[PDB]
């Protein structure tokens, strides 16, 4: 009859599911202001008293009967009940299974169970003799050596279609994780049985989203529906986050608490082994304090200290391995058995929201339409806004001690430490993502809209759409020292409206001075943005947001970096554009809080967007800004025309690079480019190519593409389907040399054999999609080599041709594409 007395804390704990089951996600009817609130059904206020104090529940030590040996017995058997030389360690071997060795360690005061069969031989099997100081050191060094080797093991483990995780082999024989008759029986128990073995109590979780959204039918204005349908986008966007935190919280309660218990037992069990070995060394030192020839208690006595130091070092690293194994394995459970469940429900809910909005569009088209184009204008905001939101794994990681590879983002220590203020969106709320503090006052009218990686702040033209950043102690450095500003700004293209409602009015974007007061200003003049400094003399530096210095509605990383009082270099991209000398000015001292607001704009239809508005202590070097700019982009993401990442079921037409302004049209039997249509952007004798030309086409993950990610990848080959109908961009089954695009629209009758799988990918990472198709066994017996999509001209008509291409040493230029999706900053009209 074995005993196992454990602390109340150290027992496995699982959150009660009653709270989470009762939690519900209800259907909503969003209105102009937000959700409809009807006071008729709202509960009447009751004002009875009840004291909040709950009397503490008396507790006492209890006994629990378990039929089979549990992990607690495996932990009770390793604490040293005896602290003398008579103490011996017990390790599993052929003689008896480890489940049998534990019962022999519990019932006896003089035995400690230990999964390590090696260090047992040096401890139990081999005992030192107090004769000469030479042999003990060989013993003393050995017991530290094998223990370090035995506890330091870290074997890689692999699974089919899942991320390979590094695991500790001996945890199976250390905490009774599973059937551990052999040391290696842990590895094959992790495989073919999953990460359920790590958890004692099988968790139970929930499937939310029993409801969908809608738009109210009580709109009376052109602007009411536009403001109402904009609220539906935001309400859906927030719910994509609320469910994420609701599911993440459920994972913490039902899974990661058990893992913290499993990891905490590793802290204890190894400490027991470290304690007994360190205890043995101390008594070993005292056991050899007789028969001294001198210098053996000064030299080869530090070795005893060395043995003590080595034992703790091995345990400290072994604990780090436990954090990198168990704690990483917790997220891998989340990424496999939880995230696919929630992603399926959200997509199912988001599809239901699309049906409701489109139904609401049809009603709006009937009554009070403006007949702009096919009686539907805000369909641009719907597809653009209904973008899937990737799970921000910074929720789980921040809970975890190990510096997991799941971070997978590395920034320069000098650059990161120089960061002071970093405005941005994190889980659908404006936050100051810096480690410092700044008093930020988020305006009411400011709305979060989808951006480059996370959402972007939309500084609307309305009065209450401002962000205020107080100049506290941290931000006092903007007075007489170097400072760098970086931000992703998407200024909409210089419109006819912009150039008619105002001509030379320069209105602010980021304001930090008042009239007759010093400060720095970011302003827009006649469609060009510029940096302003007020000091001894006001200094204004233009900034090119594109070629010809005019706004193009393209996501740009403007970085007014250098304010070193020697030069003011600006990096619109990784490359410098303009510079000036600041000898004239000496300081910028103002108490006025940093304001992000459009003040003085005559046009009331201008959206200015910001994603990562950062402040840096240093005037970043040309090297740093290149690293800063290149940090945002990854070698694995693909972006559309404006730099937003591609999304499934987003409607965007694609145009070539060389043949600008020419969309996709269907010729006799192929895919061709329509003749270029060129329009006037501003209306003053200048003509530039149109963008929204050709087939309105989307792209969806292929059937043969297993990757279960929500957004496309430089991989995850994706079929191209026309929005208009079941039409797929692909090739004919029988191709020899005329590798033109069938654009069959057929996958139903005798044409299932259509190679419609493409691999969109961007080498230089500048919003230029290069559609790569791999070699396939073409029907009729021909083998057709891999290559991208290009242009080949027959007679007067161009054609989409699959030109041969193997790797990056070939010329992929003039074979690229740009995907353009509507947007309300680029209007294609007279």
């Amino acid at each position: 009859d074995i005993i196992a007395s454990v602390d109340k804390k150290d027992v496995f704990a699982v959150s009660d599911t009653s709270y989470f089951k009762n939690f519900k996600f209800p259907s909503k009817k969003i209105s102009d202001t937000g959700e409809v609130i009807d006071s008729t059904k709202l509960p009447q206020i009751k004002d009875t008293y009840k004291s909040s104090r709950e009397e503490p529940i008396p507790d006492n030590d209890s006994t629990i009967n378990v039929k089979n040996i549990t992990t607690y017995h495996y932990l009770e058997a390793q604490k040293p009940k005896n602290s003398s030389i008579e103490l011996t360690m017990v390790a599993p071997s052929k003689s008896k299974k480890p489940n049998d060795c534990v019962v022999e360690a519990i019932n006896d005061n003089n035995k400690i169970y230990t999964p390590f069969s090696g260090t047992a031989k040096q401890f139990n099997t081999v005992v030192p003799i107090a004769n000469t100081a030479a042999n003990v050191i060989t013993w003393l060094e050995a017991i530290a050596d094998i223990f370090s080797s035995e506890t330091g093991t870290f074997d890689k483990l692999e699974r089919a279609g899942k991320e390979t995780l590094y695991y500790i082999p001996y945890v199976g024989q250390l905490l009774s994780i599973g059937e551990n008759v052999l040391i290696g029986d842990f590895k094959n128990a992790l495989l073919n049985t999953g990460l359920i073995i790590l958890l004692d109590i099988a968790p139970e979780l929930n499937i939310p989203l029993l409801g969908a959204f809608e738009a109210y039918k009580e709109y009376k204005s052109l602007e009411e529906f536009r403001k109402a349908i904009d609220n539906v986008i935001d309400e859906r966007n927030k719910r994509w986050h609320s469910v994420y935190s609701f599911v993440a919280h459920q994972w913490y309660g039902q899974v990661n608490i058990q893992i913290e218990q499993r990891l905490n037992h590793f802290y204890q069990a190894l400490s027991y082994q470290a304690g007994v070995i360190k205890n043995r060394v101390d008594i070993e030192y005292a056991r050899h304090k007789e028969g001294l020839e001198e210098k053996e208690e000064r030299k080869l006595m530090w070795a005893s200290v060395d043995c003590i130091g080595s034992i703790e070092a091995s345990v400290k690293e072994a604990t780090k391995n436990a954090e990198k194994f168990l704690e990483k394995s917790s997220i891998l459970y989340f990424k496999e058995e939880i995230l696919p469940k929630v992603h399926k429900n959200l997509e199912e809910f988001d599809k239901n929201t699309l049906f409701n909005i489109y139904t609401n569009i049809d009603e709006f088209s009937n009554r009070g339409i403006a007949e702009i184009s096919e009686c539907k204008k805000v369909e641009a905001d719907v597809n653009n806004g209904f973008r899937p939101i990737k799970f921000d794994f910074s929720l789980l990681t921040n809970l975890m001690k190990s510096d997991s590879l799941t971070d997978e983002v590395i920034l320069e220590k000098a650059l990161e430490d120089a960061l002071v203020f970093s405005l941005g969106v994190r889980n659908g709320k404006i936050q100051n993502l810096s480690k410092k503090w700044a008093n930020l006052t988020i305006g009411t009218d400011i709305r979060v809209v989808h951006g480059r990686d996370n959402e972007s702040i939309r500084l609307n033209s309305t009065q209450d759409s401002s962000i205020q950043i107080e100049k506290n102690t941290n931000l006092r450095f903007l007075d007489s020292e170097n400072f760098s500003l970086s931000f992703w700004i998407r200024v909409p293209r210089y419109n006819k409206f912009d150039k008619d409602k105002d001509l030379n009015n320069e209105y602010t974007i980021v304001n930090n001075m008042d009239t007759a007061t010093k400060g720095f200003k970011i302003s827009i003049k006649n469609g060009i943005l510029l940096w302003t400094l007020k000091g001894t003399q006001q200094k204004t530096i233009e900034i090119p947001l594109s070629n010809t210095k005019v706004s193009d509605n393209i996501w740009r990383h403007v970085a007014i970096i250098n304010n070193k009082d020697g030069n003011c270099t600006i990096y619109v991209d990784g490359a410098q554009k303009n510079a000036v000398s600041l000898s004239g000015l000496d300081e910028i001292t103002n108490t006025l809080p940093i304001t992000l607001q459009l003040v003085g704009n005559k046009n009331k239809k201008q959206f200015i967007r910001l994603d990562q508005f950062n402040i840096y202590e240093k005037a970043l070097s040309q090297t740093e800004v290149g690293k800063l700019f290149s940090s945002y982009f990854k070698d694995s993401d693909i972006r559309d025309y404006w730099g937003e990442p591609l999304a499934y079921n987003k409607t965007y037409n694609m145009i070539n690079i060389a043949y600008q302004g020419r969309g996709l049209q269907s010729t006799n039997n192929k895919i061709s480019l329509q003749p270029k249509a060129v329009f006037d952007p501003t209306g003053d004798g200048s003509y530039i190519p149109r963008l929204y030309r050709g087939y309105d086409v989307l792209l969806q993950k292929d059937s043969q593409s297993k990757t279960t990610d929500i957004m496309p990848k430089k991989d995850d080959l994706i079929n191209i389907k026309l929005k208009s109908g079941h039409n797929f961009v692909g090739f004919n089954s029988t191709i020899d040399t005329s590798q033109k695009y069938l654009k069959l629209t057929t996958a139903l009758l005798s044409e299932v054999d259509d190679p419609k799988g493409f691999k969109l990918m961007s080498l230089k990472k500048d919003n230029w999609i290069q559609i790569k198709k791999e070699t396939w066994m073409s029907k009729n017996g021909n083998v057709i080599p891999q290559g991208l999509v290009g242009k080949r001209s027959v007679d007067s008509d161009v054609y989409l041709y699959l030109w041969d291409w193997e790797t990056e040493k070939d010329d992929y230029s003039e074979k690229q594409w740009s995907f353009i999706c509507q947007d309300e900053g680029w209007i294609d009209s007279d």
Binding site: K8, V11, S15, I45, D47, S52, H249, L440
Partner: protein, 390 residues
């Protein structure tokens, strides 16, 4: 930033019935109450029903339990407690987020109660706590610790009757909160003691939520069922106080998710108040104080929704971790209630000397500094579950 003054008292100062009062307690005796700040009442007397037994086993919810009869029983100890509390309140008042919390706690006002006849009554238990000279205007009460010297929690007289979010502290009706806080006793989290200013800020944020009737219901918590059975509870995850905490702890109903109801809570209370003018004025002022420098209107639904958004944006940045980020010096624990982490109650030998107005713990918050009694005189070791069978 806002000019408010907290006044230092001494327990030797006499009762003038103006700023120093006697508070009627559950025992029927009277405790010398002090108004350290306007409408902020502070009594150096411990909470009612001090346990006669020291040591044993802690309750199944909390992890670290400490009890001491002799604590806070002599006028010298009460004076020490009062000076420590005044120093903590002044230190929190020095910082901007603390100043915003103190402005609201003091300028707040519970709305009047409706009697059986239907007219509003000013003198109510929600706003007044009986003393020996009649009642007095109180918003928050600060006391000593209960039987558990470590305890630091905010309790009130208004709670959800049907275990549902409709309590007096959640429906927009105000209530006054009593806080049992002890500067001299601190819990250490992973070899570092919590700065008492942060914990007092936590409790006062809870008090302010209770005061304006916008609090997350305290009838919501998730029990932890060791081995998943009801009778065995090793601890509970009170969402109500986590949300007040910053850090990284995972909770479904965030505070930003909270206050979506405010639009509907404001509508409900406006309907309930429409009968009287003075009651309406208090609610409107209450709302003006919640949304900084607004001069709001709540006539129509759109103005109400705008005002609720302004309030959310105003009081979303009052949290433990946000207060730490303002301080910078003080190190805060990452999560809030790590269920499996060990906690070492530490006592402070000389709070008057070792803690200053500007920056307390001049040797840092490491257990092995400011002569921090690693573990305090008394203990109650946790409940020991025993696993036994063949």
């Amino acid at each position: 930033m806002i000019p408010i003054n907290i006044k230092d008292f001494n327990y030797s100062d006499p009762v003038n019935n103006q700023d120093i009062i006697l508070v009627k307690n559950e025992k029927g005796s009277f405790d010398k109450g002090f108004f350290v700040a306007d409408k902020i009442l502070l009594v150096p007397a411990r909470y009612g029903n001090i346990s006669t037994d020291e040591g044993g086993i802690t309750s199944k919810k909390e992890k670290a339990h400490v009890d001491k009869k002799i604590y806070l029983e002599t006028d010298s100890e009460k004076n020490e407690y009062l000076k420590n509390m005044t120093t903590l309140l002044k230190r929190m008042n020095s910082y901007s987020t603390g100043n915003k919390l103190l402005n609201l706690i003091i300028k707040g006002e519970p709305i009047y109660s409706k009697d059986l006849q239907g007219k509003f009554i000013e003198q109510t238990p929600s706003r007044y706590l009986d003393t020996n000279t009649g009642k007095r205007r109180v918003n928050v009460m600060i006391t000593g610790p209960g039987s558990n010297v470590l305890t630091k929690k905010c309790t009130h007289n208004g709670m959800g009757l049907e275990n549902d979010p409709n309590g007096k502290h959640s429906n927009g009706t105000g209530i006054l909160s009593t806080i049992e806080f002890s500067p001299n006793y601190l819990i250490a989290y992973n070899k570092c003691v919590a700065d008492p200013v942060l914990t007092l800020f936590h409790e006062l944020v809870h008090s302010m939520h209770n005061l304006y009737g916008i609090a997350f219901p305290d009838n919501v918590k998730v029990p932890y069922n060791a081995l998943k059975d009801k009778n065995l509870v090793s601890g509970e995850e009170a969402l109500s106080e986590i949300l007040t905490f910053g850090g990284k702890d995972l909770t479904t109903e965030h505070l930003e998710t909270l206050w979506k109801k405010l639009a509907e809570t404001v509508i409900i209370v406006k309907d309930f108040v429409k009968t009287d003018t003075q009651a309406k004025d208090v609610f409107l002022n209450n709302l003006r104080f919640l949304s900084k420098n607004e001069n709001i209107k709540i006539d129509t639904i759109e103005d109400i929704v705008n005002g609720t958004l302004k309030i959310k944006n105003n009081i979303s940045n009052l949290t433990e971790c946000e207060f730490c980020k303002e301080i910078g010096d003080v190190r805060i624990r990452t999560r809030y209630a790590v269920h499996s982490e060990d906690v070492t109650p530490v006592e402070v030998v000389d709070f008057k000397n070792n803690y200053k107005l500007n920056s307390g713990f001049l040797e840092g918050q490491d257990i092995s500094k400011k002569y921090f009694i690693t573990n305090p005189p008394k203990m109650r070791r946790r409940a020991l579950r025993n696993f036994k069978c063949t």
